[PDB]
Amino acid sequence: TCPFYKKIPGTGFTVDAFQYGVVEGCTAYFLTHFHSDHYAGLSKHFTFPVYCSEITGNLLKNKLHVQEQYIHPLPLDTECIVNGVKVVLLDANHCPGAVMILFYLPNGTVILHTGDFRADPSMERSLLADQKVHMLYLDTTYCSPEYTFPSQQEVIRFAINTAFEAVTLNPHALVVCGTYSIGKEKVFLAIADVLGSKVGMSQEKYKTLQCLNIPEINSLITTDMCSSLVHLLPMMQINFKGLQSHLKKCGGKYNQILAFRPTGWTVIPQTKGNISIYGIPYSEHSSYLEMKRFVQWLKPQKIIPTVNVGTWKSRSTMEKYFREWKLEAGY
Ligand SMILES: O=c1c2sccc2n(C[C@@H]2COc3ccccc3O2)c(=O)n1O
Ligand SMILES: O=c1c2sccc2n(C[C@H]2COc3ccccc3O2)c(=O)n1O
Ligand code: NI
Ligand SMILES: [Zn+2]
């Protein structure tokens, strides 16, 4: 059955609820972003209205083959009405097309659903700053104080320097970036840019990137694997066995592979010869401190976690931090 934290009280709206069949009473199915854990169950056979960002709409149409008639894209930072309810979509600082949703209920209740997000101080200078938020449906992925990771700017700097130094030393080295979900494009795009290269990838991945409305995307990506010094591979192929196999397929060129595995929370590489694999802490979710700062700024009356809610221990642990944040901030 559809869980309580995927339903919007006082409306017939659900959020990221496509793996429970037809949810009783639901008139509009919202999709925060095009990540599999969240669109799970959506297919070409889905027959109900889906509300989402323009970018997510492109991906629904072109990758999932959802009929255009059920896809209702909405602009960002724009007040819109859906089934009689005022809503606003805000950038979630997650992956391309990912949004947070502000629901303005008729009774004056304001609900913010963060989808997946990486909290940032720029959100404290947005449409959120105006009205009060009574319920917060919160991406609690890393709601534990051990979850610290650097800024995205810091991780990109390490990746760029690592890649530039390795290829300037060895002009015949190959850089590979593991990708699965959309998101974290800055990793391979920044590496390619500093190497004066395009990023080669499979046709299915090129098609995915073409849906993302990235400025000047045809100037940085290509399907011609041979021509590029940066290759995208499925993340499950980012291993010594796969990188050796991929090493041979490049017409015997490239005598070295430098690979990046962009993992959120776990730097030296695992090296088996001419192959090195860097796990880099590029996250598109809030760290604990970023999450805590956002919530203490927003001062919501009620928090509904949407992540790690499946065990009583995790729910109890998150409620403790919520109380600590509320006591410390005085709301
Ligand atoms: O919906 C998901 C799902 S479903 C299964 C995995 C995920 N992840 C990746 C997880 C997030 O939490 C993590 C904590 C520690 C290490 C890796 C992690 O990776 C996610 O980041 N999101 O958003
Ligand atoms: O934000 C994310 C991220 S970040 C990295 C992966 C994801 N996923 C995909 C899910 C399902 O597939 C996965 C496979 C491997 C690791 C995590 C996964 O999580 C997601 O569904 N969301 O929403
Ligand atoms: Ni996600
Ligand atoms: Zn997720």
Swiss-Prot record:
Binds constitutively to TP53BP1. Binds CDC27, which is itself a component of the anaphase promoting complex (APC). Binds PIAS1. The keyword Metal-binding applies. One of its GO terms (molecular function) is beta-lactamase activity. Induction: During mitosis. The mRNA encoding this protein contains an internal ribosome entry site (IRES) in its 5'-UTR. This 5'-UTR generally suppresses translation while specifically promoting expression during mitosis, when cap-dependent translation may be impaired. Signal peptide: none annotated. Keywords: Cell cycle, Cell division, DNA damage, DNA repair, Hydrolase, Isopeptide bond, Metal-binding, Mitosis, Nucleus, Phosphoprotein, Ubl conjugation, Zinc, Zinc-finger. Expressed in brain, heart, kidney, liver, pancreas, placenta and skeletal muscle. It is found in: Nucleus. One of its GO terms (biological process) is double-strand break repair via nonhomologous end joining. GO terms for cellular component: fibrillar center; nucleoplasm. May be required for DNA interstrand cross-link repair. Also required for checkpoint mediated cell cycle arrest in early prophase in response to mitotic spindle poisons. Possesses beta-lactamase activity, catalyzing the hydrolysis of penicillin G and nitrocefin. Exhibits no activity towards other beta-lactam antibiotic classes including cephalosporins (cefotaxime) and carbapenems (imipenem). This is DNA cross-link repair 1A protein. Belongs to the DNA repair metallo-beta-lactamase (DRMBL) family. It comes from Homo sapiens (Human).
